[PDB]
RNA sequence: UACCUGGUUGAUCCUGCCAGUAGCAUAUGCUUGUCUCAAAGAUUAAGCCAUGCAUGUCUAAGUACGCACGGCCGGUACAGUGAAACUGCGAAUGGCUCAUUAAAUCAGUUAUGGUUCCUUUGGUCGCUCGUACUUGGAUAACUGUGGUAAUUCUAGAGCUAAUACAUGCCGACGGGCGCUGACCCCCUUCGCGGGGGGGAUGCGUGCAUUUAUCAGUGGUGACUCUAGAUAACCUCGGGCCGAUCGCACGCCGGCGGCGACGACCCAUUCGAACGUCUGCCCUAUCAACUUUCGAUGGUAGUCGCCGUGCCUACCAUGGUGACCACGGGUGACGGGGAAUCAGGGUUCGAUUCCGGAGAGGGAGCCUGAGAAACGGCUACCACAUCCAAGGAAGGCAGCAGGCGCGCAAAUU
RNA sequence: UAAAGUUGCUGCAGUUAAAAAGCUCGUAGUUGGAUCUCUCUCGGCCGAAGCGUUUACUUUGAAAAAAUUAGAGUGUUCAAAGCAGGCCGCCUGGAUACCGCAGCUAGGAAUAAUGGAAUAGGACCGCGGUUCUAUUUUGUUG
RNA sequence: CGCUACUACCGAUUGGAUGGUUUAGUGAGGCCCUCGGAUCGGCCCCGCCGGGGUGCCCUGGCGGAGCGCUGA
């Protein structure tokens, strides 16, 4: 389970790992401190973030990124990105003139952080407005609630 | 584009100024001060449009460049000088003094005051800072900054500033059952006693305010401004006592004036 | 002239984008600042709101931290080894943010020894230069020599950081953004961060 | 006002259209006496322009030895009005037009905790610990010599200023604080004993600029916020802590009151910019589109005022579509809004308010807080002006006016 | 534009007037049968705290430029308009409504929906067994 | 079916007309030349007597050059 998968060190740019130690008062890897916040409007922040050991910066929890706007709502359909998932918005818009609703959906592709680990294709997620991540993606994933239809 | 505009079409601009349309093309655009653009009362309106101290803006001129005119106890040349709530405007030639208080339907009210009252202002703090040295700091709705200021004043209180020294003389808390008028919205103007205040975190508080007859009304909580502690006002308030007359009423006091006055 | 624009790009869907106006001055970009090593060498320029930007073209001294020790000095820059986006920026030698660096262990060394009561370490071949001596070994009255042994008591370097300072180089990793500010600032490596970078430069030679 | 009428047949019911009917908008014809208000070269040609004007600006308070005028002593630096010229500011507003532009612009909503911000208003402004009773190249105006067919072209020479600009530490000058430590004294003891305060040649002392713990001062829903502390750094193209003016005549080598102008930096005053939560016309005789050329995402950087494939390198194949992607068309700028009222709708919105875009077409820039500015510059393309043929000068979709185009629109 | 119920959502028509695919499966779309009425803190009616299963409604309450439109007042000499008008210096007005959809807030739960226990992998109870202890103590800190 | 009131498609046509729509080359440009630097500048080694903290040497007009030192 190797976190240094790319051509950079990974590290969290909060936490200093490089404190001097006691030689008689260490015995293995002693501890290495986790840097996380809690996200306001009631969002807990998951066990796996707290006691995780990825580094993602645009991660909610453990990264640089602040949840302010809208908080929405969506199904996860895809996730064949890296720590990116697409998810569908489905809603229905009022035509005035039959007096009616057509059904209608946006996809928005949303940063999902590794403390949300085997979310499944269908699962309703919480996303809340972040600053621009990549192109396309402005929200991030807060909360996973499962399917009805799971295990 | 490309840069600041500089002027300020009539029909634009705000409509408590009670601008006519068929003056001119444009309205004297408030220069930029302590109040916001559209929360203002430019200098030209209060002496030419409500006064009729002046008939044109020439005159307004005149009147301002013989210093005669002072705002917040300072004099002010500026034709167009954003003045806003609750600010003083004390002119020494007639000896009268006026405080900008909206009226209830929502506009600037000739509201004179006398000399003794003349010499403070309520100021809404907006926030609260640490800087330089660990040497707190106090901003308000008037764009001042006050350091040194009392541990107890938080954000959304109202101090009690006098105008000569511009130190804070008192404060009031913002909690239920203070007095507070409301400056923005369609309640704009009204005067009442905070009796709730629903917090939305991460959007706009509401505030809930009773008036003196009972009637209740909301507004978000940036536009709630505390006037006094408990339900008595620490400033005058203008002819109406800031309740609000529903059309049927207000037609019914008109024509019982007409009638009793010939 | 260069674009930050995102309205020359397509669109998520894939569509082609029409521009609606002209590119505009706030959306302008500058050519790189290729920092290489040399004699100091920083060209100003003007950027939006009146502010200044530090266009760094050549540098050879920077302010780097021994973080562990919270001992920083101004050091002189002398080689790029590692670079995590592009090989050219290593063979041609460019400061930027986040390259690995070689920079000159003489400063660090010498707080050192103003901070040395360490036991017999490296004093194998000796130096025989006299008045340097004078840092290790002194005249000290009974409480100050109290004070470094309690000093020494809690004094430990890694062995890859003795090994760096040996051959007189250190390795450091810019954290300035030296195109921008003018400055090629930064920490020495130490710990997994060392080993990791070393780890890259071996697997690259 | 929730309305119908004529026409197919030899005649009759009916489908069904044609025609009638009322408003509205542009043109046009005939006619026209008062009076009030009032649109008006949008449609074709964002076609081409003669000429004139449309952006300038001085207070007591930046610089006055221009007798250009002018005073009350031509032995009291500057009495005053003051054209020129340097300096500062504005010229990025306004006005015009609707060519481009179909999630683009725009509208409502929200965010900047992801940025910049001239000016206004509060306004950190003796918080730096070893020539200041005022410093220096200059240069315009002015005087003279000129060149060119020609321009708001400018050269050479003689003078002379500052608010383009301070590289002072005579002043808080004893400092205080944290240090590579020559002297000092103690608790049951003459055996290395564990712990306490002063002291100098020798080092440093601010939030705008990047690489750091426990309190984590005061805040937010949430900071990697604010504040604090230690180690250091601080740009040829330096960096803030003031080298100046205002008529009264006043105080126990000196102090003083009002101002003006500057200037870092904090305060969203005016904004701008960037985020697409939702909503836009017709078209399938447009069904798949995007990915040497970033297409979707990740990592690290570059650049940018900032977030971001914005750009680069590497990595992963993603991303969007019948809930119309992509492509095409629009006599498409978007909206507020405008034309009948049964109810519902159908059309229109170039057009005075808001937002956007453009200045013949593209492109690139200087200055500046703010422009990719065109009543700014530099090229090319298309037109086009003067020429002595060497060269020089252009941009009315500003107000008027012309030509052209037209069914179609005013006074140099 | 109305007339055009000749584009029909309200609200057309399809045996013979123009018209139901030759027939049947079928995915998306649209529609879909009955059925459920010491949890919580200062004083024995109060702010906080709510996963009540998110919603769709419905009704409120904020926020939605002005002008236009609707509309209140006011003898422009009447009116279109305008935002204004007398009394041998004083009184006033310069309202209000609407502002679709999408966002924000608040009762009761009729009615598309969504159904929380079915290999039980389902509240409440005694065990703290190595751990953080009102950010370990509570005579001069052990 | 030997008459006209009757533009376009097909044109054994490539005869024509504001027609830039992308390859491949060339190529404008704020000269951001790190190869460039006769000119322009208070001491730099002097002419010499402006005059002093000593009509006696830390001097107030460089007459005046030398790719030597520095400055946009």
Redesign the pocket.
């Known amino acids: 389970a190797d976190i240094q998968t790319?051509?950079?060190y990974?590290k969290?740019?909060?936490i200093?790992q490089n404190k001097k130690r006691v030689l008689l008062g260490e015995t293995g890897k002693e501890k290495l401190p986790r840097?996380y916040?809690?996200?306001?409007?009631?969002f807990k922040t998951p066990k796996e973030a707290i006691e995780g050991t990825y580094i993602?910066?645009?991660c909610p929890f453990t990264?640089?990124?602040?949840?302010?706007?809208?908080?929405?709502?969506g199904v996860v359909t895809?996730?064949?990105?890296?720590?990116?998932?697409?998810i569908r918005?489905?809603?229905?818009?009022?035509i005035?003139?039959?007096?009616r609703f057509?059904?209608?959906?946006?996809?928005?592709?949303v940063?999902l952080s590794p403390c949300f680990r085997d979310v499944q294709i269908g699962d309703i997620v919480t996303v809340?407005?972040?600053?621009?991540?990549?192109?396309?993606?402005?929200?991030n994933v807060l909360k996973v609630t499962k399917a009805?239809?799971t295990? | 584009?490309?840069?600041?505009?500089?002027?300020?079409?009539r029909?634009?601009?705000?409509?408590?100024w009670?601008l006519?349309?068929?003056?001119g093309?444009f309205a004297p655009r408030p220069?930029?001060?302590?109040?916001?653009?559209?929360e203002c009362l430019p200098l030209i309106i209060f002496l030419r449009?409500?006064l009729k101290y002046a008939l044109t803006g020439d005159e307004v001129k005149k009147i301002c460049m013989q210093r005669f005119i002072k705002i917040d106890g300072?004099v002010?040349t500026?034709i167009t000088?954003?003045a806003g709530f609750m600010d003083v405007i004390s002119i020494d030639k007639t000896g009268e003094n006026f405080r900008l208080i909206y009226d209830t339907?929502?506009?600037f009210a000739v509201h004179r005051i006398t000399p003794e009252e003349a010499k403070y202002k309520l100021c809404k703090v907006?926030?609260?800072?640490?800087?330089?040295?660990?040497?707190?700091?106090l901003?308000t709705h008037?764009?001042?900054?006050?350091?040194y200021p009392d541990?107890l004043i938080?954000?959304n209180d109202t101090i009690q500033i006098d105008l000569e020294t511009?130190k804070i003389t008192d404060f009031i808390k913002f909690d239920t059952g203070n007095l507070c008028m409301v400056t923005?919205?369609?309640?704009?103007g009204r005067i009442g006693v905070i009796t709730?205040?629903?917090?939305?975190?991460?959007?706009?508080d509401?505030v809930h305010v009773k008036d003196a007859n009972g009637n209740s009304?909301?507004?978000?909580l940036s536009?709630i401004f505390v006037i006094g502690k408990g339900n008595k006002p620490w400033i005058s308030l203008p002819?109406g006592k800031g309740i609000?007359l529903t059309?049927a009423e207000?037609?019914d006091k008109?024509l019982a004036?007409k009638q009793s006055?010939? | 002239?260069?674009?930050?624009?995102?309205?020359?790009?397509?669109?998520?869907?894939?569509?082609?984008?029409?521009?609606?106006?002209?590119?505009?001055?706030?959306?302008?970009?500058?050519?790189?600042?290729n920092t290489k090593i040399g004699?100091?060498?920083?060209?100003?320029?003007?950027?939006?709101?009146?502010?200044?930007?530090?266009?760094?073209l050549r540098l050879d001294?920077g302010?780097f931290?021994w973080?562990s020790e919270?001992?920083?000095?101004?050091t002189r820059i002398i080689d790029v080894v590692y670079?995590?986006?592009?090989?050219e920026?290593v063979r041609t030698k460019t400061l930027?943010?986040?390259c690995i660096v070689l920079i000159d262990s003489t400063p660090y060394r010498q707080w050192y020894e103003?901070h040395y009561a360490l036991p017999l370490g490296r004093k194998k071949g000796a130096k025989l230069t006299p008045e340097e001596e004078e840092?290790l070994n002194?005249?000290?009255?009974?409480?100050?020599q109290?004070?470094?042994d309690?000093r020494k008591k809690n004094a430990k370097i890694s062995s890859l950081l003795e090994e760096q300072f040996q051959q007189g180089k250190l390795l450091a990793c810019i954290?300035?953004?030296?195109?921008?500010?003018?400055?090629a600032?930064?920490?020495v490596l130490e710990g997994k961060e060392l080993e990791f970078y070393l780890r890259k430069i071996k697997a690259r030679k």
Not at chain 2, 126 to 137: A, E, L, Q, S, Y
Not at chain 3, 138 to 144: L, T, V, W, Y
Request: some cysteine; glycine content about 10%; overall charge positive.
């Open positions: 790319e051509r950079a990974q969290q740019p909060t200093f840097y916040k809690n996200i306001g409007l009631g993602d910066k645009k990264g640089n990124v602040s949840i302010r706007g809208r908080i929405l709502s895809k996730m064949k990105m890296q720590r990116t998932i697409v918005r489905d809603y229905l818009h009022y005035r003139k039959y007096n057509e059904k209608r959906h946006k996809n928005m592709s940063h809340g407005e972040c600053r621009p991540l990549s192109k396309t993606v402005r929200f009805a239809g295990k | 584009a490309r840069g600041p505009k500089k002027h300020l079409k029909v634009a601009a705000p409509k408590h009670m006519d349309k068929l003056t093309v220069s930029t001060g302590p109040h916001k653009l559209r449009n409500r300072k002010r500026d000088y954003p339907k929502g506009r907006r926030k609260i800072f640490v800087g330089t040295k660990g040497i707190p700091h901003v008037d764009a001042r900054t006050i350091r541990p938080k954000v511009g923005g919205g369609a309640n704009l709730n205040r629903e917090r939305h975190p991460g959007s706009f509401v009304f909301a507004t978000r536009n002819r609000r059309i207000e037609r008109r004036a006055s010939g | 002239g260069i674009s930050r624009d995102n309205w020359h790009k397509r669109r998520k869907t894939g569509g082609k984008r029409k521009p609606y106006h002209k590119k505009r001055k706030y959306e302008l970009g500058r050519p790189a600042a004699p100091r060498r920083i060209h100003t320029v003007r950027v939006r709101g009146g502010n200044k930007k530090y266009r760094a001294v302010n931290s973080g919270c001992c920083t000095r101004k670079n995590a986006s592009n090989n920026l930027v943010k986040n103003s840092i002194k005249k000290r009255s009974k409480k100050i109290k004070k470094y309690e954290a300035s953004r030296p195109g921008q500010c003018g400055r600032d930064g920490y």
